[PDB]
């Protein structure tokens, strides 16, 4: 059986609700759990889902250049696959492999409706409304590495207030938007899930970039290209779209 | 130096307009030519651009299983790369390799404005308005293979009328929409180029599927993963976005 690392993130991966105790893979449900099941149907592998220990997606540390999160688990061969909303990025592709994308997305802004804020630039040009992102994720890394003035300014702001504006999880960021004057830089796919359930919230502006979620594998894994082929089949059959419809309702 | 196969298709690849006759790589410009130039800078290769001889993207003969177009050029190792609006598909990924996508898109419908036609289903349930797609491309292949009722029905319509409703190129299909009661199934990226320039035309409905364009290589090529990393570099620095804005 393949060891599959993943992370709790609605509506991709969550704990299934039952009146009775649940065990093994049956504990989990969500878009990525359905994806994993479909991949196993096509490719014929068995698997064991395990939540990532540190609860992080994956980032490289400045000083010791060590990785954390699901990325680290693949690097160290503690997992065979990462099936999660894991963004395919330049720096990650240098240390792990990824299937082709099963979903495409971009960074955008989650905030309230009816305000004068209409873009990242509007946030960058002020300090009254705090804004931030998930710590040690692809969104934070985008801002940290950007040479675009607007985003460079936004990183300077977030970095100098790390403790107060960066959050541990999307759920924490979403809660901050709901309970304080705060705008959250996060992925558009997940924004769509939030805005269909919270009618006072909206995406602000467009997509700031473009990226895909892919299944992660250790570098050189033979499963990478097989999973790509299975994803392409599921897309063309209309199955990924049905799965998106099911979980984003 | 690498041999790069490609295909004429606005605004991805076109012949540069000029008074002085042009030679070799100078003959070409477009989104995909800019992409090729950026990839060459990052990876440090030189290249010769050659248009695909048979003028096709690539499909498999369903009797003997032989391929044509750019896909065939890669299979036969007649080109090192295909840099073009070449859709990454299940059937192609089994015979060639692709970089990760530099652009994402989906099949949709090009038609005229002001009608009650709002979806593929609306087209499928009638015959007065003819519809078709490019022969031997990914869009046609999607319909040919689909188990989805509506799309299976549309394939029955298109295949039975192959001579009259399938076209050799996007340009031919677009001209048909402009000059007759015809709706053209084509890729949303290319629709966007067209509707920005022809105000009487519009996309009908949403995306019917989702796919990306990738740089093609022969199976097992070491350039594949290198080009993926270069594409990710270009995306992250904002260049792919600037490239699309320039050509659209
Ligand atoms: N999906 C992101 C985490 C969330 C975010 O950074 O917005 C990643 O793969 O790192
Ligand atoms: N871009 C398509 C051709 C055009 C189409 O099929 O709509 C391909 O790669 O085959
Ligand atoms: Cl790949
Ligand atoms: Na890699
Ligand atoms: Na392949």
UniProtKB/Swiss-Prot annotation, chain A:
Record topology, Extracellular segments: 116-249
Taxonomy, superkingdom: Eukaryota
The record's account of how the chain is modified after translation: Sumoylation mediates kainate receptor-mediated endocytosis and regulates synaptic transmission. Sumoylation is enhanced by PIAS3 and desumoylated by SENP1.
Record: glycosylation sites: 200
Effect of residue 200 to Q: Loss of glycosylation
Expression (tissue specificity): Highest expression is found in the olfactory lobe, piriform cortex, dentate gyrus, hippocampus, granular cell layer of the cerebellum, and in caudate-putamen.
Sequence positions that bind L-glutamate: 85, 87, 92, 138-139, 187
Subcellular location: Cell membrane; Postsynaptic cell membrane
Note: The postsynaptic actions of Glu are mediated by a variety of receptors that are named according to their selective agonists. This receptor binds domoate > kainate > quisqualate > glutamate. It does not bind AMPA without coexpression with GRIK5.
Function: Ionotropic glutamate receptor that functions as a cation-permeable ligand-gated ion channel, gated by L-glutamate and the glutamatergic agonist kainic acid. L-glutamate acts as an excitatory neurotransmitter at many synapses in the central nervous system. Binding of the excitatory neurotransmitter L-glutamate induces a conformation change, leading to the opening of the cation channel, and thereby converts the chemical signal to an electrical impulse. The receptor then desensitizes rapidly and enters a transient inactive state, characterized by the presence of bound agonist. Independent of its ionotropic glutamate receptor activity, acts as a thermoreceptor conferring sensitivity to cold temperatures. Functions in dorsal root ganglion neurons.
Subunit structure: Homotetramer and heterotetramer with GRIK5. Tetramers may be formed by the dimerization of dimers. Assembles into a kainate-gated homomeric channel that does not bind AMPA. Can form functional heteromeric receptors with GRIK4 and GRIK5. Can form functional heteromeric receptors with GRIK3. Interacts with DLG4. Interacts with NETO2. Interacts (via C-terminus) with KLHL17 (via kelch repeats); the interaction targets GRIK2 for degradation via ubiquitin-proteasome pathway.
UniProt record similarity statement: Belongs to the glutamate-gated ion channel (TC 1.A.10.1) family. GRIK2 subfamily.
The name this protein goes by in its record: Glutamate receptor ionotropic, kainate 2
Organism, as annotated: Rattus norvegicus
Gene that this polypeptide is encoded by: Grik2
Part of the full-length chain shown: 432 to 800 of 908
């Amino acid at each position: 059986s393949l060891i599959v690392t993943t992370i709790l993130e609605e509506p991709y991966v969550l704990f299934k609700k039952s009146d009775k105790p649940l065990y093994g893979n049956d504990r989990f449900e969500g878009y990525c759990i359905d994806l994993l099941r479909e991949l196993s149907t096509i490719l014929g592998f068995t698997y064991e889902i395990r939540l990532v220990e540190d609860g992080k997606y994956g980032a490289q540390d400045d000083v010791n250049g060590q990785w954390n999160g699901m990325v680290r688990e693949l690097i160290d061969h503690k997992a065979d696959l990462a099936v999660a909303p894991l963004a395919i990025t330049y720096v990650r592709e240098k240390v792990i492999d990824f299937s082709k994308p099963f979903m495409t997305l971009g960074i955008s802004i989650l905030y309230r409706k009816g305000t004068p804020i209409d873009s990242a630039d509007d946030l960058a040009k002020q300090t009254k409304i705090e804004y931030g992102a998930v710590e040690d994720g692809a969104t934070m890394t985008f801002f940290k590495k950007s040479k675009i003035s607007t985003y460079d300014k936004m990183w300077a702001f977030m970095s100098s207030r790390r403790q107060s504006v960066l959050v541990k999880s999307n759920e924490e960021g979403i809660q901050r938007v709901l309970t304080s004057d705060y705008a959250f830089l996060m992925e558009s796919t997940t924004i769509e899930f939030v805005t269909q359930r919270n009618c006072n919230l909206t995406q602000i502006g467009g997509l700031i970039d473009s990226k895909g979620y892919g299944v992660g594998t250790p570098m050189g894994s033979p499963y990478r290209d097989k999973i790509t082929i299975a994803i392409l089949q599921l897309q063309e059959e209309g199955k990924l779209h049905m799965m998106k419809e099911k979980w984003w309702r």
